[PDB]
Symmetry: D2
Subunit: 414 residues, 4 copies
């Protein structure tokens, strides 16, 4: 049995794809595979006060269909919270609530996702021309293979550690913060270093300050202070559906300009309110004569070693041009992520995929990889399109339209 489309991974991107498929009048068969036991949307960073970075209007479907049964508003309504929510006058739900929104949408779906199912490889199906791919799925029981005309790869961002630093028992990447943190002894983390100057770093430092009154925190970052995230209406336009076209059709020079001027809409920056809350906390501690937040500015973490009961963090100071050591209990690296890269999954097929001069994957406007003529199957990317489609690639800004264009593309070809 050969499916019209198979989705690899089940985060928000393929969820919105599933929703788009259901709402389309086109009769398309599909299967989705998620390695984890259920939807798990950055649970390691589901901190108490964490808030979405996208407006509730930017949900699974609303921008494409303003009367979707899968809209965030529909979800508030069935939960009996729409009125309460509207009273609050906040365009930004909590991460906690949005996570519930995802699970609610998944349940509503007619079709069933296959959990505990890791896709291990994608191989060319039989014959010429190649009209199908073979998808190798590993369950905890048994391995198997499914066949599909089209495949949609949406496996998410990949944690990135500082060069020369490896994750270990007392060294964590931010993505795994709560998983480690909930599993400690509550008074065996009196000294924590957090590396990074982005949203993750800021939220973790905030949480630590708010959690235990006696934790001392070292916030280590290359800038002189947190840099504000730009979420003013015009800059935010780069996430408009039409701005995808502008980036896509634009020259390399124009693409560079988007990054030069507007990377501060998302990368290595912190939300205004979180910055102000941290600043207020620092100020009040100073007034109380009990400083706890140590901001190590203009600096990078360059190494970590466990020495007896201490995690020894090597810090490079850009001001002094020298390195030194800080001793803590745990090092949290909030040092960001690498883009989704379909390559590692593609091993058979990658040689049917065209690269550009700088060796990156060519991708069509409709998120479809560029292939050899012998490949006729569709390979679509949700994620990993930073270089072709722009800053919206890893974000929640454009779920409805992106998923819709992919579904239309697939239909247009069947």
């Amino acid at each position: 049995p050969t499916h019209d489309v198979v989705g690899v991974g089940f985060g928000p991107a393929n969820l919105s794809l599933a929703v788009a498929l259901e709402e389309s009048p086109a009769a398309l068969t599909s299967a989705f595979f998620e390695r984890r036991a259920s939807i798990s949307w950055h649970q390691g960073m589901l901190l108490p006060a964490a808030k979405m970075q996208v407006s509730f209007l930017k949900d699974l479907a609303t921008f494409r269909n303003p009367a979707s049964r899968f809209s965030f508003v529909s979800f508030l309504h069935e939960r009996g919270r729409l009125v309460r929510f509207a009273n609050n006058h906040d365009f930004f739900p909590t991460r906690r609530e949005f996570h519930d929104y995802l699970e609610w949408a998944e349940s509503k779906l007619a079709h069933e996702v296959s959990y505990d199912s890791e896709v291990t490889a994608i191989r060319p199906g039989p014959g010429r021309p190649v009209d199908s791919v073979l998808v190798d799925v590993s369950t905890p029981e048994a391995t198997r293979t499914v066949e599909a005309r089209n495949i949609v790869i949406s496996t998410g961002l990949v944690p990135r550690m500082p060069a020369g630093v490896q994750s270990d028992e007392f060294v964590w990447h931010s993505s795994r913060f709560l998983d480690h943190f909930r599993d400690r002894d509550p008074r065996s983390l009196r000294r924590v270093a957090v590396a990074g100057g982005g949203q993750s770093a800021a939220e973790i430092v905030r949480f630590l300050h708010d959690n235990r009154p006696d934790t001392v925190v070292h916030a280590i970052m290359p800038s002189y202070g947190y840099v504000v995230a730009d979420n003013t209406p015009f800059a935010n336009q780069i996430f408009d559906p039409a701005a995808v076209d502008d980036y896509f059709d634009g020259s390399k020079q124009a693409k560079d300009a988007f990054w030069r001027y507007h990377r501060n809409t998302n990368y290595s920056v912190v939300d205004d309110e979180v910055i102000r809350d941290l600043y207020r906390r620092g100020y009040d501690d100073e007034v109380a004569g009990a400083p706890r937040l140590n901001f190590v500015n203009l600096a990078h973490v360059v190494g970590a070693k466990r020495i007896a009961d201490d995690t020894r963090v090597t810090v490079y100071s850009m001001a002094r041009e020298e390195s030194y050591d800080l001793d803590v209990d745990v090092l949290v690296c909030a040092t960001g992520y690498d883009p989704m890269d379909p390559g590692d999954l593609l091993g058979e097929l990658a040689e049917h995929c065209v690269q550009d001069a700088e060796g990156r994957w060519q991708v069509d406007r409709d998120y479809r990889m560029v292939t050899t003529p012998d490949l006729r199957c569709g390979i679509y990317l949700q994620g990993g399109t930073e270089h072709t489609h722009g800053l919206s690639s890893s974000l929640l800004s454009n779920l409805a339209t992106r998923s819709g264009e992919i579904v239309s593309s697939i239909e247009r070809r069947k």
Copy 2:
């Protein structure tokens, strides 16, 4: 041809009723009569910067049906302004845009509304007990009559002038502000008095200040300064549909408590931002050495007379306990409105309508007037229920649910 329901007036309340009728699976016949040529939603006060006092989520239908084709979001989408709107991160549309929303919703409707049609009386149909009512409609050419099993009266708020003051060519009620203003010679309104301390008074003063750089304005109000409108999330819960119950089922003592603590949510109060804008304007004028805004606090307007080229306003000062005259070109009375009273329209029918101890109409929870067995046809009120249903009666807070409850009620009895 006897209609299931006839709507008198076509403002937002009956519009939402029309929408509720179309979305209901119940097959109900209806007709709507509006005395004006088209939807005309306080156009006299459609000032340049005027904002809705209610969230865009509080539209014609969303609270009842979160995926209505008549939602504000659907409107934005069809106009191609949903993305732009979301980027603004403002819950409050402009009055101008909301007016366009109403006209858009009216056009989408399958039913056609009858314009230029004034309802002049409502009479008992032929029968005992009465199973229908007759509805007299006057058009420019003819007069006719319509028979209905239910009526819904939604005529509006009635302009109220100060005691002992009659409107005039030089003495305007705020409701007609732009009708008189528009084409009045600019060089002829150098001195304007505005009576009142509410949202209407504040917006008019602001507009005058913004629009002619030489007008001198006297803002006359009983308070020592504008009182802020309470729109904090808890107080705003009095407009929750569950709060309608809470008022309705509550004792007279409880009802009085709503008004004594929370009338500040709507009556005789001014929006925070409008207050601050006025204050900023006054401050800057002082800095510039050119005061323009004269605030006559602890005061009321008690009379007006035209004397040669001057409108002479008699002001009573509470502080001094005396009266004095103030000469201006025009007096604008932003002195508020009276609730909608169905009584005039009913005439003949009033007698089968039950009153309470204090002489007020009794109304069931579903907005249906209490009648004597002599009457079995339904008379519903959208407006004029301040005493029975509470502060939401004249407002836009609860359109979707009240219209829905009325439609359900009519279907239930049929």
Copy 3:
């Protein structure tokens, strides 16, 4: 040794006064008596996040002297926090910081305040007409009497419990919340009722929510929800120095209008940010499926009794018009305060103080009590002037000007 002026109590008002005395070129002798061991400014309510309700510009002196050594700005500078503070862009200091500001100002003063000194009575001095008063001061060791040509009474607001409810081991007035709370065992305050819909009530409920995540709280108040405090610029003008004139010279009618329209600038109301924080808290608990905040609206606490291990709170519901019992661990009554009353302290001198029709003290514009000719000794009130001077009387809005006007009055009358 007869002093020109004696101050009873040493809160911000009398501190203000001490500052005004020092800055005045007039050579006036003065003594201040405070019952407590040191300045103690509503310490029972010094909660972690508590913020001033008045701008830092409304400090001890700035409105009268823009370049005072006692300004809040000066304080920030000396503490090396002025630059940091400026960057925060908030006009409202924390209560904790403001408390440090007061202590700092007191230390800088050339005068020394007598602490642990309770004023127990004020008596007519010798002779007629009375040219001085005698101030009875009780210390832990001894008792003594001092003599003064003028006296300034500034003893502060007085806690007010609900009628028919008495403070106790398990029934606290908000003013003493942290006093009691810091003593009790955490696992023993699982159930708390808080009565009131004002700033105190709201702050206490937020603190409980934020500081113990398994505490259940019942917020009992007469309104349908918290009412917002009006702090918009025009309404705030009622606290302007000139508005004190406007209230004072105005008829009863106009005085009543101030209260009818603008009592919501201060009484029985809650700051916008605190309301939204509480609302956010409730919302997030509902999402998590773990409700903890129970808002009991349109209601009054009418009684409390201890029954075994439970504090039984009798609540009257206005909606239903019945009463019922609610069991908790502690009842906190955030039910407000009564105005300062110079009455009790005055005793005999009250005979020489003139009352109005409704039996209240007559007070001149300069805060001096109206007296018969048999008394020429100045009695000034900082507090307790709500009926003559208006809503600024118990607040921090007008410290600089009021203190300055009292000092000027005293000096104008010395000669």
Copy 4:
């Protein structure tokens, strides 16, 4: 008569110097020369709604002396506007008010500034080593020379036009906008192009939009939309006096990091409120069906020519890598400024001043130019220290401390 110190220019920087001199117990003689007839602080850009970018606490003296007779608070008090101002709860005065503050401070000063006096050169005084400088001052009547042991150069930012574009009758630099705007006839500026994406460009566009209702405006800028200014509390720390030290003592690596991460605090960025107001204006025009603001993003102005009665602006589009002509009435170039150059008055003395490797003036922390032993007189810079002291140089953030440090330095060496 040899002065201890001579100030060239009398803007806020030297004004704070004059104040610092008067408050210092040191008896130092001084003279100040200003080319203009009076204090003239960017009057070309004194637009109606223009706000300070710096807090009122950052005034001429307060950070140094919290109880200065020259504080902004003292100013408000004398003008009887301290109470009113505090009620507003806005840290940012208007530019108009601040200008009045300057003039007020200048009048209070005991010292008398010499206006209409343009410094044309600074030359070494007699014999070696030079112990004084000679300052050539040109008045409308005559030219004279004064002698001084120290000199403070504070001549301000220098307007910078685009490469290939010259100011003219219909091509204006933003600095002269009001001077130019005012003579013109309203009916003659129906089409205006404004180049730039910074605070100047944004304010000018907003003013045009607000001041005429028919003007069509082309906003031409290299970014995809306005970039928000970073004004969050850690970011404002860059301007702390203690941060001057951090920048000064830091390596060249560290210095680069300040600019890389935090130039957005000031350069090529727009205040949050101004951005939202422009966005609101664009939105309402679209609703009204009358678009007037044309945002020409990802673009540069590269030439201008007058052709009959139009100004032909050549625009380069990065997106299309192409240029085209845009015809208008006036081109306003809001393309920024070039930092103060100590060097152009310096002439011969420049031989005795030390450059570094990249050819830049060496400057001591106390703002004094590094000289050979042949020069012993002090040359101080307020402005032109971007390289050595950082982003605070042209700004108002640090007037009190900078002026105080310079006064102390001069006293110390005397």
